Amino acid sequence: GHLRSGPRIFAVWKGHVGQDRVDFGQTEPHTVLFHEPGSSSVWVGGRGKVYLFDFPEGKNASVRTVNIGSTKGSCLDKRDCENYITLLERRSEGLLACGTNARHPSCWNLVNGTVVPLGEMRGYAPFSPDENSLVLFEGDEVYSTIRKQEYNGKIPRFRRIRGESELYTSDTVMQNPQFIKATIVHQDQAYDDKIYYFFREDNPDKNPEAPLNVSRVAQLCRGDQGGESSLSVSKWNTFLKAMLVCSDAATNKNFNRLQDVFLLPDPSGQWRDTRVYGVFSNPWNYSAVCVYSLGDIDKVFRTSSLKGYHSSLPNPRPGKCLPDQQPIPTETFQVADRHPEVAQRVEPMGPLKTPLFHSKYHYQKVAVHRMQASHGETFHVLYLTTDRGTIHKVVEPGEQEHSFAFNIMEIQPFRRAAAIQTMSLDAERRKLYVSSQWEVSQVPLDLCEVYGGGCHGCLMSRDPYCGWDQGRCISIYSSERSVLQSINPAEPHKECPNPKPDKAPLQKVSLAPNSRYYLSCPMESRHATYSWRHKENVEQSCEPGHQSPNCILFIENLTAQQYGHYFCEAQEGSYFREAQHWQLLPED
Amino acid sequence: GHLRSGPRIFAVWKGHVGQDRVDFGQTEPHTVLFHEPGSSSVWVGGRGKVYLFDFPEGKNASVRTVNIGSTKGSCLDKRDCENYITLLERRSEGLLACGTNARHPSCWNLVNGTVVPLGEMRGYAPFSPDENSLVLFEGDEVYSTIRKQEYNGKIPRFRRIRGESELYTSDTVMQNPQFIKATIVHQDQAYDDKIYYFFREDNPDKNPEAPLNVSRVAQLCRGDQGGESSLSVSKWNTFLKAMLVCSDAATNKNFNRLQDVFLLPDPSGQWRDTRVYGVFSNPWNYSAVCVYSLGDIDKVFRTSSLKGYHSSLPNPRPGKCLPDQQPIPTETFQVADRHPEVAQRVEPMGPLKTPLFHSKYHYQKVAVHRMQASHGETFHVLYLTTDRGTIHKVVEPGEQEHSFAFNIMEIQPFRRAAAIQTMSLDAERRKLYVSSQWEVSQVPLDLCEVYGGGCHGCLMSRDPYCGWDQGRCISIYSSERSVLQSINPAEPHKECPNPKPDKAPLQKVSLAPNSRYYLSCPMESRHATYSWRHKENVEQSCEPGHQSPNCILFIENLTAQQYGHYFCEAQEGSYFREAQHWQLLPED
Ligand SMILES: *[C@@H]1O[C@H](CO)[C@@H](O)[C@H](O)[C@H]1NC(C)=O
Ligand SMILES: *[C@@H]1O[C@H](CO)[C@@H](O)[C@H](O)[C@H]1NC(C)=O
Ligand SMILES: *[C@@H]1O[C@H](CO)[C@@H](O)[C@H](O)[C@H]1NC(C)=O
Ligand SMILES: *[C@@H]1O[C@H](CO)[C@@H](O)[C@H](O)[C@H]1NC(C)=O
Ligand SMILES: *[C@@H]1O[C@H](CO)[C@@H](O)[C@H](O)[C@H]1NC(C)=O
Ligand SMILES: *[C@@H]1O[C@H](CO)[C@@H](O)[C@H](O)[C@H]1NC(C)=O
Ligand SMILES: *[C@H]1O[C@H](CO)[C@@H](O)[C@H](O)[C@H]1NC(C)=O
C-alpha cells in the first residue's frame, strides 16, 4: 500500500500564551482527569488535593487547588501516607472524589466550595495509586475492580459494589487480568442489558511459541441476580469472555496487547452500531488500531460454542440474561463456570477483518471524533498518544483499496515535553485535554496555523478541519460558514486561486573558489521526497524515511563547474514544489 | 542487554585484484555451488553449462565453462527449454551433474574432461529451476523431495529414490512443505540411524491470530523397511515431526520462519553434541539465530506424547527403529500415520532456551566456524547473509549475562552489489565462498586489513582471527605463530605498546567571519558515540543509531567566539579516542 502512516507534519504550536496550558504547583506522579463536554472546567486528582482548572474560550486559563489532605489519621513514621485522589465522578449530590487516604480508601463530596467527607468506602479507591484500578457507575449501581480490603488474596475480581446484591467473579473466569475499560450496553429489552469490559490476561495456551498474554472482552448481565446454591448466590452467573483479535491479513502481523479502548455511538442510535476502537501493540512495541461493533461482539456471545465443551448447551444458554428476576439455573451456571471462554474470536468490523492501520510507533491511548468537512463529508479522526509524549492525528480510511489511513500530523502539546498520562476528547468544544506529571494542556482539534505553505500547503495537509480563506489556513468552525477546502482524491490543491505553487524566493551568496559550503533545505512535508538540483542534475536526494529534518547538499572545495543555480524541489505524489532556490555567484 | 548486534564496522575490502572473485560470462538467475573443503576448485551449475572456478592460494583466480547444453531434444517453438544444472555431487565415478534438460530431468558424469550422459533420472532434478528441491546422498542411497513426473499431484514428498526399496511419505504427514535441509544422523547402533530434515509448512492451528506457517524438523529411520500391509509397504513408517521454536525469553519475541540450517559436529565426536544452527525471521523480516542439539531433538522424538492422541502408545513406539529388518507393526504405523506431530516443542540448547541473538536485519543463510584464538581460546563465529547482499560476522556468546553476541563486521563481497545466491564455508582453507547472479567470490575468514585504528583499533575489533604484529593488524594463521591479541574483558586495547591511543593529526584552516562552514567526522566504529567539542562544550553529538556515516558539526555564519580548537571524540564503552582535531584560525 502506502506508508502515509507516518506523521506528514511535525507541528509547531504557536498558540495564545497563557490560554492553552497550565502547570500544577508541583509534580504529580499519579493523577486522574475529569471533564464534561462543553464545560470550561477541568478537574485533576493529585497528591492530597484536587486541581480545578479553568479554560475559558478565547481567554486566559488558570488553576485553583482544593486541598483534601490525608487529614484523617496522619501516620507515625512518615513514609508514603498521602491521599491520592484516584477518582472523580459527578453525581446529583455533587462531584464525588475518592482517594487512598493513607491506605484507608475514602470518598468526599464537593458541592458548593465544600469538602464533605463520606468516610471510608472500600472498593472506590485503591490502597496505593500505582494499582490497576477501575470503577463504573450506572444509576444507583457501582462496579469495581479494586479490592475492598488490603490483606485480600492475589485474585483480581470484577464486582458490583453497590446495588441489589454484591456479586464477584469466580476464580476460574480470569487469569491475572489487567483491566482496561468497562461500559454498559443497553440492548433491545432492558433485562438483556449487558456490562462489557476489556482487559488483558495470561494466555491459556502454554506452548513455548504462544504469546504470554492475550486480549479480551467479557460480558455480564446487568440484572444478574446471582446463583441458586449457597456457594453461587454471590457470584456472577452470566460471565463469558472472548478473545479480541487485531491482525493484518495481507501480512501475517499480529498485535496481541490491547492498550486502550474508546467507544463511539453511531448517529443511528442503534446500540449494535456502536464502535469499539482498540489500540494494540506487540513485543516490538509497534501498534495497530482495530474497530469492532457491539453488534458483532454480542452475536459472538450468543451463538458461539464454548472452548472445551463438546456437547449441546443447557437450555438457558450460558451468558443469556433471564427475564423476571429469575436466578441462573445451576446446570446452566456450571457449564459457564467450567467453560467461560467462547470459542470464536471477535474480529474487526466489515469484510477483511483487518486493522484500520498499523505502524512502528508505540501508541498507548486513543480517542475518536466523527466530524463533517466543510462540504458535509463525514470523517473519523483518531487521536493517538505515543510513549514519547506526543499526539498523532490520523484520518480513518473510507471507500476501498484507494483509501488508507492518513497520519496528518504529530504534536508535542506541553511546555515541558513529558509522557502523556491522560487524554480526553471534548467533541462539543472540539478540544483535546491532555496532561502530564507537570501540566494540563488544552489542544484544539481545529489547529491549522500549523500548515504553512500558502493555499497549496493548506489543502495538501488533508486535514478535514480546515481550508483556505481570507489569505490564510483556518478552522472550518471559525465564522464565515464557507471556506475553500479540498476534494479527497489526489491533487487536492487544484481548488486554489493559483493552479500552481509559489516559486521560492531567490537567495544569493558570493563565494571564493575551493571554499567549503553547504545548502540546507528544511523538509516540511514528511511524505515528500526532496532533491537538490544543479545544471539539471540531482546532486542530493532525501527520501521520506529521512532521520534529519533537513536535506543538505555539501560543497567541499567549490570548483568553477559548481557555480550557479541550485534548487531544492519537493515531490509528494504527482505534486511538485520549489522549496529552495539559491545562486552561487563568484567573488574573490 | 546491549545492542552490539549491529555491525561495528562496515568493512571496505581492498583485496588482491584478480585473486578474490571472478564473474560469469553472463547472468545466471538459477545456480548451484559445489566445493569440497581444501580444494582450489569451485563448481557452479548454471544455464546449459557448469562453471569450473580455480582459486589458487596467493595467485590469480579464473573460470572455465563446460557446456552441457540442452542437446537432448531441442524444442520447437523456443521459449524456455534450457538445461539448468541444479545438482552437483561428486561420487567415486566422478562429478555427478543433473539438470532440468528441457523438462526432461537427467544427469551427466564428468570424470576426465569428459561429459558422459546417464540419461533421464527422475527425482534428481526438477522440471523447472525455480522449484523447491532437495536431494541427499548417503552410501548408495539417494533421497529426494523432487517429483518424478510432471503431471504429479500437488503433494510434495520426501522419497528414497535409490536403495533397497522406494519409500515415500504419506498424504497425512505434511501440509504444503517447503524443504530447507536434510541430514543423516548416526546414533549409537547402526539400525537406529536417523534421517532428519527441516522445513516450513502450514500451521495446523487455523485460528485468526495464529501465524500461517510453522517451522519443523522431521525424523525417519534410515533402516525403515516399510509397513506390514499391502497399502503401507512402500510408505515410510517411522515419520515423526516436531515444531522448532525460536523465541526470546526476556521479551516475548517470536521468530517462526525458519530460513536456513547449519550443522556443526562436536569435537567430542558425540552425535548427541552436534549443534543445529537455525536462522529465523518473522512477519517484519527481523531475525534470530537459535542453536539446538541432536540430543535434545532425539529426546523429544522418543519421549513426547503425540498431539491429539490421549491413550497409551503402542509397544513398538511410533518413530522407533526396529532391529532385524522387521517391518513396522500396523498398530504402530496407524497411530503415527494419524498423529505425526509430537506435542512437545524442540527448544534451543542450554538453560534459558533463547536465541543466541536477534536483530532487525533480515538474515537468509548461516555458516559456523569453530576456531581457536592466538591464545588457544575457542570461539564460534557466525556468517550470515542479509537480503541486501551482505555478510555479517557475529561472534557467539559464551559465559553468562556479561557475554553477548558481537556483530563485528559487515561486508559487501561483490564487484557488483547483488543478492547472495549461495554461501559455503570452507574451514579447511579458512575461506567463505559466496555467489551471486554475476560472480563468485572467495572471502577470507581471516580478513583484517579492514581494521585500521592502529594497534588499538585492531584489538578493539574483537575479531578472534587477528592481532597486532610487525606494525599491523594481521591474520593469526599468517606465519610467526605469535601475535599481540586482546583479552575478552572490557578495554582489550590495554595489551598494546602505547597504553593510550594515538592523538588525531591536527588540521588547520583559515576563515573569515560570517562564512558558512562544516566539519565532518567519518564514524568508523558503529558502536561508539561521537561528539564534536569546542571550548569544552559539545556542539554536536552522534549516537550509534546514527543513519549517515558522518558526524557533522555545522557552522552558519562564523563568529569571533567560535574560533579555535574542535575535537571529534569517539567513546564506545570506557574507551576514548580522538577521531578528529581541527583548529579554526582567523584570516580575512
Ligand atoms: C495571559 O497571560 C499572559 C502571560 O503570558 C499575560 O501577559 C496576559 O496579561 C494574560 N492575558 C490577559 C491579557 O489578561
Ligand atoms: C448547594 O448549596 C445550595 C444553597 O446553599 C443548596 O440549596 C444545595 O442543596 C447545595 N447542594 C447540595 C446538593 O448539597
Ligand atoms: C503478561 O503481561 C502482564 C502485564 O504486562 C504481566 O503482569 C504478566 O506477568 C505477563 N505474563 C507473564 C506470566 O509473563
Ligand atoms: C517498548 O518496548 C520495549 C521492549 O521492546 C520496552 O523496554 C519499552 O519500555 C517500551 N516502551 C515504553 C517506554 O513503554
Ligand atoms: C591478476 O589479475 C590482475 C587484474 O586482472 C592483473 O592486473 C594481474 O597482472 C594478474 N596477475 C598476474 C601477475 O598475472
Ligand atoms: C578417468 O580416470 C579414471 C581413474 O583414474 C579411469 O578409470 C577412467 O577410465 C578415466 N576416464 C577415461 C574414460 O579416460
Ligand atoms: C506460508 O508462508 C510461505 C512463505 O511465506 C508461503 O510460501 C506459503 O504459501 C504460506 N502458506 C499458505 C498456504 O498461505
Report the CATH number that the domain containing residue B475 is assigned in CATH: 3.30.1680.10
Q: Residue A517: list chain B partners with CB under 8 A.
A: 516-517
| Atom 5 in ligand 5: residue holding the nearest Cα | B18
Of A362, A386, A390, A420, the residue with max ligand 4 atoms within 8 A of its CB, to mutate for a pocket test, comes to: A362
In Å, what is the CA distance from A534 to each residue of A546, A574, A575, B303?
21, 21, 20, 72
Element (DSSP H or E) covering residue B196: strand B194-202
Find out whether B162 and B144 touch, Cβ atoms under 8 Å: no
Distance between CA atoms of residues B55 and B37, nearest Å: 12
Secondary structure of residue B349 in the 3-state scheme:
coil
Strand partners, B99: B85, B106
Distance between CA atoms of residues A155 and A169, nearest Å: 10
Rounded to 5°, the CA angle A244-A246-A381 comes to 110
| Atom 6 in ligand 1: residue holding the nearest Cα | A18
Contact B347 A554 (CB under 8 A): no
Residues framing ligand 4 (Cβ under 6 A): A 284-285, 362, 387
Beta-strand ranges (E) seen in A112-177 are 116-120, 135-138, 141-144, 159-162, 167-168
**Residue numbers of the domain that contains A22:** 1-447
Same domain, B426 and B289: yes
Give the nearest chain A residue to B257 (CA atoms).
A252
Distance between CA atoms of residues B213 and A253, nearest Å: 13
Find out whether B192 and B321 touch, Cβ atoms under 8 Å: yes
| Atom 2 in ligand 6: residue holding the nearest Cα | B112
Ligand 3 geometric centre to CA of A200 (Å): 9
CB atoms within 10 A of CB A449: 16
Contact A254 B286 (CB under 8 A): no
Cell output for A103 = 491506605
The cell 472540539 sits on which residue?
Answer: A430
Spell out the residues 6+ positions from residue B79 whose beta carbon is closer than 8 angstroms to its own.
none
Number of domains observed in the structure of chain A: 3
Spell out the residues 6+ positions from residue B151 whose beta carbon is closer than 8 angstroms to its own.
none
Distance between CA atoms of residues B356 and B348, nearest Å: 9
Distance between CA atoms of residues A362 and A351, nearest Å: 27
Q: Which of A516, A543, A552, A557 to mutate to test the interface with B (most CBs of B within 10 A)?
A: A516
Find out whether A567 and A494 touch, Cβ atoms under 8 Å: no
Strand partners, A280: A258, A288
Give the nearest chain B residue to A360 (CA atoms).
B284
Give the nearest chain B residue to A542 (CA atoms).
B548
Give the nearest chain A residue to B519 (CA atoms).
A516
Give the nearest chain B residue to A348 (CA atoms).
B208
Does residue B509 line the site of ligand 7, with CB under 6 A? no
| Atom 2 in ligand 3: residue holding the nearest Cα | A213
Same domain, A372 and A512: no
Of B14, B60, B62, B439, the residue with max ligand 5 atoms within 8 A of its CB, to mutate for a pocket test, comes to: B60
Find out whether B293 and B272 touch, Cβ atoms under 8 Å: yes
Pair type for strands B431-435 and B422-426: antiparallel
Contact A518 B516 (CB under 8 A): yes
Q: To 10 degrees, the CA torsion angle through B48, B49, B50, B53?
A: -130
Same domain, B495 and B351: no
In Å, what is the CA distance from B93 to each residue of A143, B110, B118, B120?
83, 9, 12, 18
Ligand 7 geometric centre to CA of A363 (Å): 30
Please count the residue pairs, one from chain A and one from chain B, whose beta carbons lie less than 8 angstroms apart: 59
Strand partners, A521: A551
Q: Which of A252, A304, A555, A582 to mutate to test the interface with B (most CBs of B within 10 A)?
A: A252
Nearest to B309 by CA among B274, B273, B281, B343: B343
| Atom 13 in ligand 1: residue holding the nearest Cα | A60
Q: Which of B3, B205, B206, B209 to mutate to test the interface with A (most CBs of A within 10 A)?
A: B209
Beta-carbon-side half-sphere exposure of residue B18 (alpha carbons within 13 Å): 2
Residues framing ligand 3 (Cβ under 6 A): A 178, 202, 212-213
Distance between CA atoms of residues A82 and B538, nearest Å: 42
Residues framing ligand 1 (Cβ under 6 A): A 17-18, 60
Same domain, A441 and A453: no
DSSP state of A128: S
Find out whether A454 and A502 touch, Cβ atoms under 8 Å: yes
In Å, what is the CA distance from A74 to each residue of A79, A119, A454, B519?
11, 15, 61, 61
Spell out the residues 6+ positions from residue B78 whose beta carbon is closer than 8 angstroms to its own.
none
Contact B211 A286 (CB under 8 A): no
Secondary structure of residue A157 in the 3-state scheme:
coil
Question: Biggest alpha carbon distance in chain B?
Answer: 101
Same domain, B461 and B437: no
Find out whether B185 and B193 touch, Cβ atoms under 8 Å: yes
Phi, psi of A437 (to 5 degrees): -90, -10
Find out whether A391 and A381 touch, Cβ atoms under 8 Å: no
Q: Pick the last residue of a domain from B486, B504, B522.
A: B504
Strand partners, B122: none
Same domain, A475 and A513: no
Q: Pick the last residue of a domain from B418, B447, B476.
A: B447
Q: Pick the last residue of a domain from B504, B520, B535.
A: B504
Ligand lying closest to the C-alpha of residue A388: 4
Report the CATH number that the domain containing residue A176 is assigned in CATH: 2.130.10.10
| Closest atom of ligand 1 relative to the A60 alpha carbon | 1
Closest approach of chain B CAs to the CA of A254, in angstroms?
A: 7
Distance between CA atoms of residues A462 and A407, nearest Å: 9
Spell out the residues 6+ positions from residue B401 whose beta carbon is closer than 8 angstroms to its own.
none
Find out whether B248 and B288 touch, Cβ atoms under 8 Å: yes
Q: Residue B207: list chain A partners with CB under 8 A.
A: 345
Contact B254 A547 (CB under 8 A): no
Of the candidates A207, A252, A283, which has its C-beta nearest B253's C-beta? A283
Element (DSSP H or E) covering residue B333: helix B330-338
Contact B245 A209 (CB under 8 A): yes
Of the candidates A254, A284, A286, which has its C-beta nearest B209's C-beta? A254
Residue B410 zone, left/alpha/beta (φ > 0; ψ -120 to 50; rest): beta
Contact B209 A247 (CB under 8 A): yes
Report the CATH number that the domain containing residue A573 is assigned in CATH: 2.60.40.10
Residues framing ligand 6 (Cβ under 6 A): B 111-112, 114
Q: Residue A251: list chain B partners with CB under 8 A.
A: 283
Residues framing ligand 5 (Cβ under 6 A): B 17-18, 60
Distance between CA atoms of residues A51 and A47, nearest Å: 10
Phi, psi of A272 (to 5 degrees): -60, -25
Q: Residue A256: list chain B partners with CB under 8 A.
A: 209
Sheet of B94-99: strand order equals B85-91, B94-99, B106-110, B116-120
The alpha-carbon radius of gyration of chain A (Å, integer) is: 28
CB atoms within 10 A of CB A554: 16
Q: Identify how the structure was determined.
A: X-ray
Give the nearest chain A residue to B353 (CA atoms).
A208
Does residue B212 line the site of ligand 7, with CB under 6 A? yes
In Å, what is the CA distance from A442 to each residue of A29, A380, A414?
20, 20, 10
Rounded to 5°, the CA angle B99-B102-B106 comes to 35
Phi, psi of B263 (to 5 degrees): -100, 135
Nearest to B86 by CA among B140, B138, B145: B145
Find out whether A96 and A114 touch, Cβ atoms under 8 Å: no
Q: Residue A253: list chain B partners with CB under 8 A.
A: 283-284
In Å, what is the CA distance from A385 to each residue of A367, A420, A442?
9, 7, 14
Ligand lying closest to the C-alpha of residue A17: 1
| Atom 13 in ligand 2: residue holding the nearest Cα | A93
Pair type for strands A240-243 and A213-221: antiparallel
Nearest to A288 by CA among A362, A199, A180, A184: A362
Find out whether A69 and A76 touch, Cβ atoms under 8 Å: no
Distance between CA atoms of residues A72 and A184, nearest Å: 35
Phi, psi of B217 (to 5 degrees): -130, 135
Q: Which of B284, B346, B347, B516 to mutate to test the interface with A (most CBs of A within 10 A)?
A: B516
Same domain, B536 and B430: no
Q: Residue B206: list chain A partners with CB under 8 A.
A: none
Same domain, B57 and B204: yes
What are the b/e assignments for B329-368, b being 16+ CB within 10 Å? ebebbbbbbebbbbebbbbbbeeebbbbbbbebbbbbbbb
Q: Residue B212: list chain A partners with CB under 8 A.
A: 252
Find out whether B354 and B304 touch, Cβ atoms under 8 Å: no
**What single string gives the DSSP state of each residue in A418-462?**
----EEEEETTTTEEEEE-SSEEEEEESS--TT--SHHHHHHHT-
CB atoms within 10 A of CB B131: 15
Ligand 4 geometric centre to CA of A285 (Å): 6
Same domain, A22 and A170: yes
Of the candidates A212, A284, A554, which has its C-beta nearest B518's C-beta? A554
N- to C-terminal Cα separation, chain B: 52
Same domain, A404 and A453: no
Distance between CA atoms of residues B123 and B162, nearest Å: 10
Ligand 6 geometric centre to CA of B65 (Å): 21
Nearest to B196 by CA among B54, B296, B90: B296
Same domain, A494 and A453: yes
Secondary structure of residue A322 in the 3-state scheme:
coil
Same domain, A442 and A563: no
Contact A283 B345 (CB under 8 A): no
